[PDB]
Enzyme design. Structure first.
Site, PDB file in Angstrom:
ATOM      1  N   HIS A 168      -7.458  -9.724   4.312  1.00  0.00           N
ATOM      2  CA  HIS A 168      -7.045  -8.694   3.366  1.00  0.00           C
ATOM      3  C   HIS A 168      -8.207  -8.354   2.445  1.00  0.00           C
ATOM      4  O   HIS A 168      -9.305  -8.881   2.633  1.00  0.00           O
ATOM      5  CB  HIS A 168      -5.719  -8.999   2.600  1.00  0.00           C
ATOM      6  CG  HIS A 168      -5.810 -10.024   1.510  1.00  0.00           C
ATOM      7  ND1 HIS A 168      -5.816 -11.378   1.752  1.00  0.00           N
ATOM      8  CD2 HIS A 168      -5.863  -9.886   0.159  1.00  0.00           C
ATOM      9  CE1 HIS A 168      -5.875 -12.028   0.603  1.00  0.00           C
ATOM     10  NE2 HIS A 168      -5.923 -11.149  -0.382  1.00  0.00           N
ATOM     11  N   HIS A 171      -8.982  -8.585  -0.837  1.00  0.00           N
ATOM     12  CA  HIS A 171      -9.434  -9.281  -2.034  1.00  0.00           C
ATOM     13  C   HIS A 171     -10.683 -10.117  -1.766  1.00  0.00           C
ATOM     14  O   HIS A 171     -11.036 -10.410  -0.618  1.00  0.00           O
ATOM     15  CB  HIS A 171      -8.324 -10.167  -2.596  1.00  0.00           C
ATOM     16  CG  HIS A 171      -7.189  -9.419  -3.235  1.00  0.00           C
ATOM     17  ND1 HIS A 171      -5.921  -9.947  -3.321  1.00  0.00           N
ATOM     18  CD2 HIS A 171      -7.136  -8.224  -3.872  1.00  0.00           C
ATOM     19  CE1 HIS A 171      -5.125  -9.097  -3.938  1.00  0.00           C
ATOM     20  NE2 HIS A 171      -5.840  -8.049  -4.303  1.00  0.00           N
ATOM     21  N   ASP A 205     -11.583 -13.234  -2.004  1.00  0.00           N
ATOM     22  CA  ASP A 205     -11.576 -14.478  -1.256  1.00  0.00           C
ATOM     23  C   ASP A 205     -11.625 -14.254   0.263  1.00  0.00           C
ATOM     24  O   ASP A 205     -11.705 -15.204   1.033  1.00  0.00           O
ATOM     25  CB  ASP A 205     -10.471 -15.456  -1.693  1.00  0.00           C
ATOM     26  CG  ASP A 205      -9.092 -14.879  -1.730  1.00  0.00           C
ATOM     27  OD1 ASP A 205      -8.830 -13.679  -1.517  1.00  0.00           O
ATOM     28  OD2 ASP A 205      -8.208 -15.693  -2.078  1.00  0.00           O
ATOM     29  N   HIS A 231       1.618 -11.052   0.415  1.00  0.00           N
ATOM     30  CA  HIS A 231       0.623 -11.304  -0.611  1.00  0.00           C
ATOM     31  C   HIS A 231      -0.109 -10.004  -0.963  1.00  0.00           C
ATOM     32  O   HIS A 231      -0.462  -9.769  -2.132  1.00  0.00           O
ATOM     33  CB  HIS A 231      -0.357 -12.373  -0.130  1.00  0.00           C
ATOM     34  CG  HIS A 231      -1.570 -12.468  -0.984  1.00  0.00           C
ATOM     35  ND1 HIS A 231      -1.632 -13.258  -2.108  1.00  0.00           N
ATOM     36  CD2 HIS A 231      -2.750 -11.813  -0.916  1.00  0.00           C
ATOM     37  CE1 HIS A 231      -2.792 -13.080  -2.700  1.00  0.00           C
ATOM     38  NE2 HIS A 231      -3.499 -12.224  -1.983  1.00  0.00           N
ATOM     39  N   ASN A 268      -1.277 -15.306 -10.122  1.00  0.00           N
ATOM     40  CA  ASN A 268      -1.512 -13.887 -10.202  1.00  0.00           C
ATOM     41  C   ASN A 268      -0.869 -13.188  -9.007  1.00  0.00           C
ATOM     42  O   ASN A 268      -1.181 -13.509  -7.862  1.00  0.00           O
ATOM     43  CB  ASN A 268      -3.023 -13.679 -10.190  1.00  0.00           C
ATOM     44  CG  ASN A 268      -3.430 -12.275 -10.538  1.00  0.00           C
ATOM     45  OD1 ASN A 268      -2.933 -11.308  -9.964  1.00  0.00           O
ATOM     46  ND2 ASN A 268      -4.353 -12.151 -11.476  1.00  0.00           N
TER      47      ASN A 268
HETATM   48  C1  LIG Z   1      -9.241 -13.706  -5.165  1.00  0.00           C
HETATM   49  C2  LIG Z   1      -8.017 -13.547  -6.003  1.00  0.00           C
HETATM   50  C3  LIG Z   1      -7.792 -12.087  -6.425  1.00  0.00           C
HETATM   51  O1  LIG Z   1      -6.844 -13.991  -5.275  1.00  0.00           O
HETATM   52  C4  LIG Z   1      -6.624 -15.406  -5.377  1.00  0.00           C
HETATM   53  C5  LIG Z   1      -5.301 -15.709  -4.767  1.00  0.00           C
HETATM   54  N1  LIG Z   1      -5.081 -15.994  -3.502  1.00  0.00           N
HETATM   55  N2  LIG Z   1      -3.768 -16.236  -3.261  1.00  0.00           N
HETATM   56  N3  LIG Z   1      -3.161 -16.108  -4.462  1.00  0.00           N
HETATM   57  C6  LIG Z   1      -4.062 -15.769  -5.387  1.00  0.00           C
HETATM   58  C7  LIG Z   1      -3.739 -15.490  -6.866  1.00  0.00           C
HETATM   59  C8  LIG Z   1      -2.929 -16.639  -7.454  1.00  0.00           C
HETATM   60  S1  LIG Z   1      -4.027 -17.891  -8.160  1.00  0.00           S
HETATM   61  O2  LIG Z   1      -3.382 -18.517  -9.297  1.00  0.00           O
HETATM   62  O3  LIG Z   1      -5.213 -17.351  -8.675  1.00  0.00           O
HETATM   63  C9  LIG Z   1      -4.405 -19.017  -6.872  1.00  0.00           C
HETATM   64  C10 LIG Z   1      -5.533 -18.778  -6.123  1.00  0.00           C
HETATM   65  C11 LIG Z   1      -5.839 -19.650  -5.074  1.00  0.00           C
HETATM   66  C12 LIG Z   1      -5.012 -20.701  -4.822  1.00  0.00           C
HETATM   67  C13 LIG Z   1      -3.899 -20.921  -5.584  1.00  0.00           C
HETATM   68  C14 LIG Z   1      -3.582 -20.040  -6.631  1.00  0.00           C
HETATM   69  O   LIG Z   2      -6.566 -13.059  -2.796  1.00  0.00           O
HETATM   70 ZN   LIG Z   3      -5.372 -11.634  -2.373  1.00  0.00          ZN
HETATM   71 ZN   LIG Z   4      -6.275 -16.144  -1.842  1.00  0.00          ZN
END
Ligand SMILES: CC(C)OCc1[nH]nnc1CCS(=O)(=O)c1ccccc1
Ligand SMILES: [O-]
Ligand SMILES: [Zn+2]
Ligand SMILES: [Zn+2]
Length: 230
Positions: free
Chosen positions: A83, A85, A87, A148, A179
């Site tokens: 996707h 984003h 990461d 997501h 988030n």
């Molecule tokens: C790159 C960013 C925009 O996305 C990160 C993400 N990837 N999947 N969810 C999220 C947001 C929730 S988080 O609290 O930042 C989170 C991050 C990673 C592991 C656990 C928890």
């Molecule tokens: O993400």
């Molecule tokens: Zn994402």
């Molecule tokens: Zn992620």
């Protein structure tokens, strides 16, 4: 002995053997004031390697390529971002500079552009509708529907029964979404059920962040998502 967030300094990348010819890559990055681990996949593609997702940033992605060369020694020739984003696409420019052909769906490419993120070069056709699947070398790419993100893909390695969920699948220990910007919380459970329907034979399920599990991660993710929705 799957590596955990505290064990990987930001800038370093670990490889973990899941099955013959299938690895995850694990990196760490700061986001919203904390450091999180992030997973992607590496799949043997004959004499080449197929990469699923960057290592969450340019520096990490360069470390990823170095670790691959050191430990596996085969060239990464194609990469797929699941996707838009950072990461998943952050590091695409490093991949391209190293000679890797980068791919994503048209939707992912457009959304990355709008976001100001790096843009994979090539478009993946045949993934625009929920339930769509295409072969891409040694994997199947599947669009389960919005979850997501609206563009999120999952990846199955049929020879190894490995399902990589990207950020649409949560690790078992994760009890909150964090988030939810760009998420479709209302569709997410439905998209999860599509994954279950299509890959009921999956033996290893790799979440976008955190420890591998089984198909139990699907219901777990739905529970966390709904609990946010509720
Ligand atoms: C790159 C960013 C925009 O996305 C990160 C993400 N990837 N999947 N969810 C999220 C947001 C929730 S988080 O609290 O930042 C989170 C991050 C990673 C592991 C656990 C928890
Ligand atoms: O993400
Ligand atoms: Zn994402
Ligand atoms: Zn992620």
């Amino acid at each position: 002995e799957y590596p955990t967030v505290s064990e990987i300094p930001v800038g370093e990348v670990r490889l973990y053997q899941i099955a013959d010819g299938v690895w995850s890559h694990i990196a760490t990055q700061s986001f919203d004031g904390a450091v999180y681990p992030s997973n992607g996949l590496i799949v043997r593609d004959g004499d080449e390697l197929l990469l699923i997702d960057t290592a969450w940033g340019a520096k990490n992605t360069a470390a990823l390529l170095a670790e691959i060369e050191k430990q596996i020694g085969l060239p990464v020739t194609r990469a797929v971002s699941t996707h838009f984003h950072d990461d998943r696409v952050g590091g695409v420019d490093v991949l391209r500079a190293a000679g890797v052909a980068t791919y994503a769906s048209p939707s992912t490419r457009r959304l990355a552009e709008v976001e100001g993120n790096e843009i994979p070069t090539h478009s993946l056709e045949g993934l625009s509708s929920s339930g769509d699947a295409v072969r891409f070398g040694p994997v199947e790419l599947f669009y389960p529907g919005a979850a997501h993100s609206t563009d999120n893909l999952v990846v199955y390695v049929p020879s190894a029964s490995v399902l990589y969920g990207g950020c649409a699948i949560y690790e078992l220990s994760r009890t909150s979404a964090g988030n939810v910007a760009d998420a479709d919380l209302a569709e997410w459970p439905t998209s999860i059920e599509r994954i279950q329907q299509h890959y009921p034979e999956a033996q290893f399920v790799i979440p976008g962040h955190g420890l591998p599990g089984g198909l139990d991660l699907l219901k777990h993710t739905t529970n966390v998502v709904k609990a946010h929705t509720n």
